[PDB]
Amino acid sequence: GSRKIIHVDMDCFFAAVEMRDNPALRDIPIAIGGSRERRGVISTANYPARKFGVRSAMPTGMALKLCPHLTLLPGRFDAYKEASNHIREIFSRYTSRIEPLSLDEAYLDVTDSVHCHGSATLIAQEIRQTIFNELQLTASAGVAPVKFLAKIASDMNKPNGQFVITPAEVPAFLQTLPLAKIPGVGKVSAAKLEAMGLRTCGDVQKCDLVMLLKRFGKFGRILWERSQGIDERDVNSERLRKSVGVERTMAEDIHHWSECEAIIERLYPELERRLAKVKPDLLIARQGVKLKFDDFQQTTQEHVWPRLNKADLIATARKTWDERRGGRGVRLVGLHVTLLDP
DNA sequence: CTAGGGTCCTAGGACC
DNA sequence: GGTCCTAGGACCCT
Ligand SMILES: [Mg+2]
Ligand SMILES: [Mg+2]
Ligand SMILES: [Mg+2]
Questions:
Q1: What's the CA gap between A19 and A258, in Å, rounded?
Q2: Cα gap A163→A114, rounded to integer Å
């Protein structure tokens, strides 16, 4: 009853597209991200920049101190969406069991596939080669019997490589696998788990489910299961977007409501244009706003509302501005919408 | 020196 | 007791 799951993951996705499209960037350290003046962060970087320590989510000021010659690009999201569409169409040549997780990655269930004599190893290889040939971008893959292991596997032998975990191999693999490598166990949880002597899945196997449940809720069950290779989540392929949001961090904190309102007036046409691509009538389930203060606390207020409406978004921003700003400056304003259910 | 795009879980009170 | 409404926050991707 063993399934074959493939995880495919593009290498340095945004950066790889910039190099393909401008070969002058191939061998110098580059990065997509907001500028230091914009108070931005690094979205991604190429391997010459990562050599210096540059990583995704790093403040750009830190990126520039580690790598003073970093060339900073603003990002061409239509070019990335284009490549993303193409790889998903390449996935569809092999199976309809495709669950994308972001622009540049997807799960595939090829258990019932007849390509490559049913070899999931050979299918992943054909997909990576077919992605290089037609997009001039490279990809890595992971093959495993369950989702999370296949996704860990695709990280292990990148760039432009893959890694296979057979059922016979998973107990040795799990025994020293750091918990933090499981998708969904993040920095906070890893630090909690560390602080009680739990670092690897091997550690968690020595733990009682009842204890983990009390101490972590449903998260504890997930921990207990993943630590034994248990991950029965199906590859979906029918998932749908539930919300759309637009927000901007200003280069300077704002302190006056006129400033906040001026910002909303520019965010709103962008939110409308994007909602309209998916919902021409703008019919929604909820709409709302987001403020991030200078103590980095963040608040949102959203409410039931039937149709994208700009003045209600301003009025809600007004209450939030008065009722819970407490004289702090504000570094970010955001608009938000929750999509109807079907 | 801290983005912007998202998903999902938790939790309390309202409402049934 | 279910389900909805709302807020917050961990986490994912680049
Ligand atoms: Mg990637
Ligand atoms: Mg990815
Ligand atoms: Mg990444």
A1: 42
A2: 21
**Nearest nucleotide to A102 by CA–C1' distance?**
C13
- CATH class held by domain A1-21+75-175: alpha beta
PDB resolution in Å: 2.3
Nucleotides of B under 7 A from a protein CB: 1-11
Whole-number distance in Å between A248 CA and B12 C1': 31
How far, in Å, CA of A234 to CA of A3, rounded? 10
**After which residue numbers is chain A interrupted with C–N beyond 2.5 angstroms?**
none
Establish whether the CB of A48 is closer than 7 Å to any nucleic acid atom in strand B: no
Options A37, A105, A252, A261, the catalytic residue:
A105
Q: Return the domain boundaries, chain A.
A: 1-21+75-175, 22-74, 176-230, 242-342
Which CATH number does A22-74 carry? Answer: 3.40.1170.60
Give exposure, A270-288, as e/b (b: 16+ Cβ within 10 Å): ebeeebeeebeeeebeebb
Q: Residues with Cβ < 8 Å from A90, sequence gap 6 or more?
A: A127, A130, A131, A134
